[PDB]
Design a protein around this ligand. Structure first.
Ligand SMILES: [Mg+2]
Ligand SMILES: [Zn+2]
Ligand SMILES: [Zn+2]
Ligand SMILES: [Zn+2]
Lengths: 147, 67, 45, 113, 89, 49, 263, 113, 84
RNA sequence: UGUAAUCCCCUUGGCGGUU
């Protein structure tokens, strides 16, 4: 019924093995005269409503570095947007939420190696990043082939 | 992209015969005679060298990203 | 604090999260991060 | 065994309806089960499940099979049932629906088998 | 020692009644997100990162394939500033 | 200068061949994202009617 | 009762004829040589720098397929059976590769001859990548241009071809019996005449063709088997044959011990 | 994603016995043997060796599924002989055959070296 | 009024497959909710299997109420309906 | 004793896969 049998040893030797790249884009938006988004590693204290993933793979500038293995739901771009502070200045020792998280997580079903990170400026002069992820896909039961 | 180390079907090592194959073809030998001179009997091995396309010579023409 | 590489002349430098995104010597607008210093291991399979 | 080891469970539901998530519980071994609670265990062998392929032209396009857990990422069928489903293995996909009650399990095993 | 029991059967005070607890009967992982190396088992010498640290069963994602595996604490070597250290970090 | 620039860019970006405020009743799908899955697919896409 | 007769012998291939053995024994020997003789192959790659145009895992896969000399692999232990923390010298071999291109013109080829053995078991002849001669450069691994460098450290472990095809010592084992089809084990497709439409076997001269008046013999069994064992250079042909026999013996002895200890 | 580890083809778990024997009561003097982490290599060898013994009246084996590394063998001997003794005799006989084969190959290789 | 007397019951005396499935499901659910079991259990543990064992022995304590189109109904005990 | 986190558009259009 249109199935086929493949040699496992040929697959081990590199038959029909391929390479997969996926790129992610993000940029800093401008909402007003001094309301800008920032690429940064958000902290559990100064930001609220964080993603359930892990932020420990981000660098100081909020961007992951190439060569780092990533898994699903990991944060590859760290971005925060400002929020008007609440009355928490009552008795909080500077530990009050002023920013909201807008980070970009890796897709839940995908994982791989960070291949190349690009940082530049858009037409408007704001920061603009692109992250490319690389993985290898080996043939297995269910993959589609054709003559 | 670059000559495979092992033949997919059986597993003979063909990765060390690319340079010799090119040298033989340079001297005017036919492809069949060149493959015979390298002791590639089974056609499963012969297709590996015969149908290989060398793309790394095109990737190397781009300026390296670091220095 | 973190290294960067220019996209044209491949010149290494660093930024302090306040400099304009630009290569210091050729003024290119596209720069790349440098590879991590962690260990990278593969299963050779 | 927890939600990562097969056979395992994902939730424990008390009588009042509260759900205990076993991923975020640090004292899973310190849980005692009382009669009448529900355990959302993993799918196991010989569980009846409804199996379906679109378009569902006739009533033989939805039939209930018995689960057998296997490696790799494809559903597997005896080839005799590829006729009622009008299915072949050149890329077709099929839908699986899990009953969630004793009554529904009995209906699947006694009517749609 | 006071417990505030509420029952739908009781109508008085919307079922709320106070009863002492003595008169009733019942009816931060410091190795998380750290590079680790495996020293025993079928994954000897593979670098990973610890993801789950409930207890005595650590979930470590492997850098070599794209998968995450459970592993006992005794099988790990946590990286430090001076080489590899066994499970005493 | 924004009129022509925005009109051309919008029509080429979205594929709706017309003015931005007359998106309905305009011929859609004229402009498509180039298929770069393989070389033959790109060549086929560039010669499609 | 079993007999062996060698036709051709070389360091890399032996062509021999087995006789007075069952077909099952010969096939089990072939299967054991193909997928159950332990060899040594690179199993972990630590990439300290790779600025070449090839992906890191591309080069890792290529490295794993390079055959390494596995003569004394019996003395070596399996990685999972070694009580040592991390890897010691008795369960792993460490090779290191460092390649670089100097000058602003030309292309540098990275060969398997550049793999240098750093550490391994004492006085055991294992780990060195296989070379055809003293002047054979070996398997082409990568290519580099100016300012591209490859600096890696590889660890070789002992395994069998069941786990991954890179540990297989043999390439292709030709196997053949009954060239003249006296046993009628196959039925020959044909258009006009089946005799002149099918090429003769390469061992057809080693057996007398059936007589025209001969009747079918229902009491006969396959008795002589012709098989050629080709190796990748990690192990010699005689070593492959002998170690396949020894592996089969060990498997049967393990079964026997299990039976005797079951009671 | 769901692909099992390759070492599970030959590495035996601690709790799994290598060799489980259960009697077959439907016919006299018959046993069913379940080999774990084995395949046609050992099975066919044992089967064709045992088929030649005059006191073995039935021997067969099957691999239930290619995705699981085990096989099950059915053996049934005469009244005088216990089947397990026949299995041991088969193992020892094949070992002797392999030993003499190795000796003869070594002699021939030394002669033709 | 709406109930039909036992002497004048005219529906089929057999357990239809829908009634069998519904009875088995309800009995299995009730057993899973710690209802008393009316048959001896040898080694069975599945509620559905216990329900089937009860049904085979005509020990299920349930009543089928079959609704006629006009609204009248017949009450049949599961112990008096013939099961195949 | 310092104790770790839970959340996601909509509309549209195109391109596809299985019949
Ligand atoms: Mg189809
Ligand atoms: Zn070949
Ligand atoms: Zn520059
Ligand atoms: Zn060791």
């Amino acid at each position: 019924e249109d199935s086929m049998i493949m040699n496992q040893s040929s697959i081990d030797r590199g038959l029909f093995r391929s390479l997969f790249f996926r790129s992610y884009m993000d940029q800093e938006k401008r909402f007003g005269i001094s309301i800008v988004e920032e690429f940064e590693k958000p902290t559990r204290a100064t930001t609220l409503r964080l993603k359930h993933g892990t932020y420990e793979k981000l660098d100081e500038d909020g961007l992951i570095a190439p060569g780092v293995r990533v898994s699903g739901d990991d944060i590859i771009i760290g971005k925060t947007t400002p929020i008007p502070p609440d009355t928490e200045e009552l008795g909080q020792r500077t530990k009050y939420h002023t920013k909201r998280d807008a980070s970009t997580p890796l897709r839940s079903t995908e994982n791989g190696i960070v291949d190349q990170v690009l940082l530049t400026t858009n037409q408007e002069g704001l920061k603009f990043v692109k992250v490319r992820m690389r993985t290898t896909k080996v043939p297995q039961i269910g993959d589609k082939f054709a003559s | 992209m670059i000559i495979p180390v092992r033949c997919f079907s059986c597993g003979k090592v063909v990765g060390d015969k690319w340079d010799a194959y090119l040298r033989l073809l340079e001297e005017g030998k036919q492809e069949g005679d060149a493959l015979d001179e390298l002791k590639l009997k089974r056609y499963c091995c012969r297709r590996m060298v015969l149908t290989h396309v060398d793309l790394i010579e095109k990737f190397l023409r781009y300026n390296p990203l670091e220095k | 604090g973190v290294k960067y590489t220019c996209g044209a002349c491949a010149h290494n430098f660093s930024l302090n999260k306040s400099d304009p995104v630009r290569c210091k010597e050729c003024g290119h607008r596209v720069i790349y991060k440098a590879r991590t210093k962690r260990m990278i291991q593969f299963d050779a399979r | 065994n927890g939600p990562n080891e097969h056979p395992g469970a994902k939730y424990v539901i008390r009588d009042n309806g509260d759900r205990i998530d076993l991923r975020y519980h640090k004292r899973a071994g310190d849980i005692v089960l009382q009669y009448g609670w529900k355990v959302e265990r993993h799918l196991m062998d010989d569980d009846p499940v409804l199996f379906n392929r679109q378009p569902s032209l006739h009533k033989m396009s939805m039939m209930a099979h018995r689960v057998k857990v296997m490696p790799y990422s494809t559903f597997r069928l005896n080839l005799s049932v590829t006729s009622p489903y009008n299915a072949d293995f050149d890329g077709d996909e099929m839908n699986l629906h899990v009953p969630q009650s004793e009554e529904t399990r009995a209906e699947l095993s006694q009517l749609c088998a | 020692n006071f417990l505030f029991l509420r029952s739908r059967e009781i109508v008085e005070n919307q079922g709320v009644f106070v009863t002492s607890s003595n008169r009733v009967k019942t009816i931060r992982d410091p190795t998380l997100n750290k590079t680790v190396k495996i020293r025993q088992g079928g994954y000897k010498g593979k670098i990973g990162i610890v993801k789950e640290a409930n207890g005595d069963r650590f979930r470590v994602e492997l850098h070599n394939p794209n998968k995450t595996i459970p592993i006992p604490c005794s099988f790990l070597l946590i990286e430090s500033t001076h080489g590899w250290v066994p499970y005493e970090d | 200068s924004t009129t022509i620039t925005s009109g051309l860019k919008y029509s080429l970006a979205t594929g709706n061949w017309g003015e931005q405020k007359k998106a309905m009743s305009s011929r859609a799908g004229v402009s498509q994202v180039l298929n770069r899955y393989t070389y033959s697919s790109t060549l086929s896409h560039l010669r499609r009617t | 009762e079993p007999k062996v007769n060698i036709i051709n012998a070389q360091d890399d291939e032996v062509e021999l004829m087995l006789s007075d053995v069952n077909l099952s024994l010969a096939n089990s020997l072939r299967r054991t040589m193909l997928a159950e003789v332990p060899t040594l192959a690179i199993d972990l790659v630590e990439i300290k720098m790779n600025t070449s145009v090839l992906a890191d895992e591309f080069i890792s896969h290529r490295l794993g397929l390079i055959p390494l000399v596995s003569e004394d692999v019996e003395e070596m232990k399996y990685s999972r059976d070694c009580t040592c923390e991390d890897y010691c010298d008795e369960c792993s071999v460490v090779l290191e590769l460092s390649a670089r291109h100097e000058g602003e013109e030309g292309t540098t080829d990275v060969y398997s001859s550049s793999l240098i053995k750093v550490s391994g078991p004492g006085n055991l002849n294992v780990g060195e990548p296989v070379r055809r001669d003293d002047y054979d450069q070996g398997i082409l691994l990568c290519k580099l241009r100016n300012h591209q460098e490859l600096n890696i450290r590889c660890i070789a472990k002992k395994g069998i071809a069941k786990e991954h095809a890179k540990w297989s010592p043999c390439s292709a084992i030709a196997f053949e019996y009954d060239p003249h089809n006296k046993l009628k084990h196959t039925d020959f497709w044909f258009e006009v005449d089946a005799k002149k439409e099918w090429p003769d076997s390469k061992y057809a001269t080693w057996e007398e063709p059936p007589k025209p008046g001969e009747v079918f013999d229902y009491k006969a069994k396959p008795n002589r088997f012709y098989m050629t064992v080709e190796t990748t250079g990690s192990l010699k042909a005689n070593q492959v044959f002998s170690r396949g026999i020894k592996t089969l013996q060990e498997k049967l002895a393990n079964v026997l011990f299990e039976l005797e200890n079951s009671r | 994603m769901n692909a099992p580890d390759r070492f599970e083809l030959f590495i035996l778990p601690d709790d799994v016995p290598k060799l489980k024997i259960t009697p077959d009561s439907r016919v006299p003097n018959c046993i069913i043997i379940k080999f774990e982490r084995e395949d046609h290599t050992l099975a066919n060898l044992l089967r064709e060796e045992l088929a030649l013994y005059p006191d073995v009246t039935f021997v067969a084996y099957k691999v239930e599924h290619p995705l699981f590394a085990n096989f099950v063998m059915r053996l049934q001997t005469e009244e005088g002989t216990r089947p397990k003794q026949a299995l041991e005799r088969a193992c020892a006989s094949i070992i002797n055959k392999l030993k003499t084969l190795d000796h003869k190959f070594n002699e021939e290789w030394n002669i033709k070296n | 009024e709406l109930a039909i007397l036992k002497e004048e019951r005219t529906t089929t005396p057999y357990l239809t497959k829908y009634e069998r499935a519904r009875i088995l499901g309800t009995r299995a659910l009730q057993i899973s909710m710690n209802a008393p079991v009316l048959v001896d259990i040898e080694g069975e543990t599945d509620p559905l299997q216990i329900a089937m064992k009860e049904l085979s022995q005509r020990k299920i304590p349930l009543v089928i109420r079959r609704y006629l189109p006009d609204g009248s109904y017949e009450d049949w005990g599961c112990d008096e309906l013939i099961v195949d």
